[PDB]
């Protein structure tokens, strides 16, 4: 298959003709929500996407 921007969104299995979507492996940037180190050292992590 193909997506709008030339991306392999779907493949068909050669041994058995089934249509398989390729959701990409989920990934995202790691951000740290913290106040100042003068105030505390407790952190909160926001995982995006």
């Amino acid at each position: 298959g193909r997506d709008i921007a030339d991306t392999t969104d779907a493949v068909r299995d050669p041994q058995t003709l089934e249509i398989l979507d390729i959701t990409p492996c989920s990934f995202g940037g790691v951000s740290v929500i913290t106040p100042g180190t003068n105030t505390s050292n407790e952190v909160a992590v926001l995982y995006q996407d």
């Binding site: 709008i4 921007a5 030339d6 991306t7």
Partner: protein, 49 residues
Amino acid sequence: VLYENQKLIANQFNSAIGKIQDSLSSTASALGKLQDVVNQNAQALNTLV
């Protein structure tokens, strides 16, 4: 001039607001700047892919 002629101002104002809602209902070309911005961003992203 207001206080002798306010009801005609009321009808003109309500009819003008109805004219705006008819203008937005009739065409989607009023929002062409916003659609141009969104198309520019999606165009740059697809160009990147």
